[PDB]
Amino acid sequence: AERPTLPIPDLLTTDARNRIQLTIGAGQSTFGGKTATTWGYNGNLLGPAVKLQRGKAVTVDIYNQLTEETTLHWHGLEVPGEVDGGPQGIIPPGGKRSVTLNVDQPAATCWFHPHQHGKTGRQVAMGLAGLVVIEDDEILKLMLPKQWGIDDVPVIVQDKKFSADGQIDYQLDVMTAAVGWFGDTLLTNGAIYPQHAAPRGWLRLRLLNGCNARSLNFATSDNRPLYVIASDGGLLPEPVKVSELPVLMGERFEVLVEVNDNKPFDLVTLPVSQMGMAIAPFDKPHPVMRIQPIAISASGALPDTLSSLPALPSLEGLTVRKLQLSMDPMLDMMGMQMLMEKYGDQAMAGMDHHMNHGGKFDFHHANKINGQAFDMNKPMFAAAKGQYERWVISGVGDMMLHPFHIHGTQFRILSENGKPPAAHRAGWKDTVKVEGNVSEVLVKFNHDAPKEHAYMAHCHLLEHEDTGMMLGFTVG
Ligand SMILES: [Cu+2]
Ligand SMILES: [Cu+2]
Ligand SMILES: [Cu+2]
Ligand SMILES: [Cu+2]
């Protein structure tokens, strides 16, 4: 049969009352011809792309039609804690919450997803994610590919696994609390290996790793390059040509790729060196989507310069914050043992060369920052507003992958896991790799966050977050 076409999320803008309506609800999707219960925003699975403009405010009305509590976080948006939608931003089942977003950051592709305390991994795995497209005056002048769903297309890549009855098979248990929830089925905007028909010339892909725990590495099947034009928080100063593009959980990159008549090619993900993630079929390059060239000229440009990136400031005298990530050694060893027993040696491919003892030994609080599993009631510190700070995040002590995310900012990486950042990772980021080593970022918070609606900082391997690897912090 033919491949399904790549689903395109609707691009949503405000009404005359300056409102955007988002309904959270459960419905059915089909995977491989079997129905599954799934959750979506304004539909059964995934969500729309909310379009925002710098310097304009919009109001979002969020209707929770699930039968359990949820929250809605705008990953990558710099907004006050009161509207950030972290764990404290509860929307009761059957209820509504509205937030007004005063957008004040450069053009970028951001995204949104639940942040329910202890349950973020299940609620994302069940289907909830959407996109945010921020525009500003500067980016339109570049004349990039801009026809949504034609030569400018979002690519949300996620894995799932399913039980024999067809349902999503999600579990937060000792194994997934150590290495993450991952599956054997790759979805691209919710579809299995779709095709996208693109005009001749440049195709812009807005890539999101929406997996709970799987890192990805994008490339093309015939080795044509990808031109990175933007990271999590916006445009790079100029395009950066790459042959492959690692993307951690929750990160975005925008790339341009050439489309030539008569030569279809796949976007693929290459096997990664992360525990558990190279089990067949991910032990080999795995197609993400087929690009099918159409003999109609695409009008978008790849300019030589994209934007201006300010220099790093002097570092001397800046507040230095230490964030030590850690995993309980027993539950790390028990979860890795369960992974090895299940899949064998292949669960470490590509890597470098039973009784109840009480709540002190519960894996639900086994992962920690600065010795503490996340405590919703006690922000760990008060960060300055309007001031640059150097945050130092260490994963020394274990060898798991921690894509560390900080709410309320777009930062600059100074060191990524012990090395200067790659050029396409040197601009605006909201995630930094931490794996067995130390990273340092330069952050500044432009908005307030009080104790009652604190900002979060956490590993974005969702099963780590949900079992304690998160802290709250206030600003102002
Ligand atoms: Cu996120
Ligand atoms: Cu976030
Ligand atoms: Cu982690
Ligand atoms: Cu978060």
UniProtKB/Swiss-Prot annotation:
InterPro entries: Cu-oxidase-like_N (IPR011707), Cu-oxidase_2nd (IPR001117), Cu-oxidase_C (IPR011706), Cu-oxidase_fam (IPR045087), Cu_oxidase_Cu_BS (IPR002355), Cupredoxin (IPR008972), TAT_signal (IPR006311). This is Multicopper oxidase CueO. It holds the Pfam family Cu-oxidase_2. Contains a methionine-rich region, which includes a helix that covers the entrance to the type 1 (T1) copper site and blocks access to the T1 site in the absence of excess copper. This methionine-rich insert is involved in the binding and oxidation of Cu(+). It also binds additional copper ions, which are important for the copper-associated regulation of activity. The methionine-rich region provides at least three additional Cu(+) binding sites: Cu5 (sCu), Cu6 and Cu7, which play related but distinct roles in CueO oxidase activities. Ferroxidase and phenoloxidase activities are enhanced considerably in the presence of excess copper ions. A labile regulatory copper ion near the T1 copper site is important for the copper associated activation of enzyme activity. Ag(+) acts as a potent inhibitor of oxidase activity by binding at Cu(+) binding sites, blocking Cu(+) substrate binding and oxidation. pPD oxidase activity is strongly inhibited by sodium azide, an inhibitor of the electron transfer. Triggering CueO activity at need by the addition of copper salts with minor toxic effects on E.coli cells could be used as a simple tool for biosynthetic purposes. The protein was also identified as robust host protein for use in biosensing and drug-screening applications. GO terms for cellular component: outer membrane-bounded periplasmic space; periplasmic space. Optimum temperature is 55 degrees Celsius with 2,6-DMP as substrate. SUPFAM superfamilies: Cupredoxins. Multicopper oxidase involved in copper homeostasis and copper tolerance under aerobic conditions. Is responsible for the oxidation of Cu(+) to the less harmful Cu(2+) in the periplasm, thereby preventing Cu(+) from entering the cytoplasm. Probably primarily functions as a cuprous oxidase in vivo. Monomer. One of its GO terms (biological process) is response to copper ion. It catalyses: 4 Cu(+) + O2 + 4 H(+) = 4 Cu(2+) + 2 H2O. It comes from Escherichia coli (strain K12). Residues 27-137, 199-264, 361-475 form the Plastocyanin-like domain.
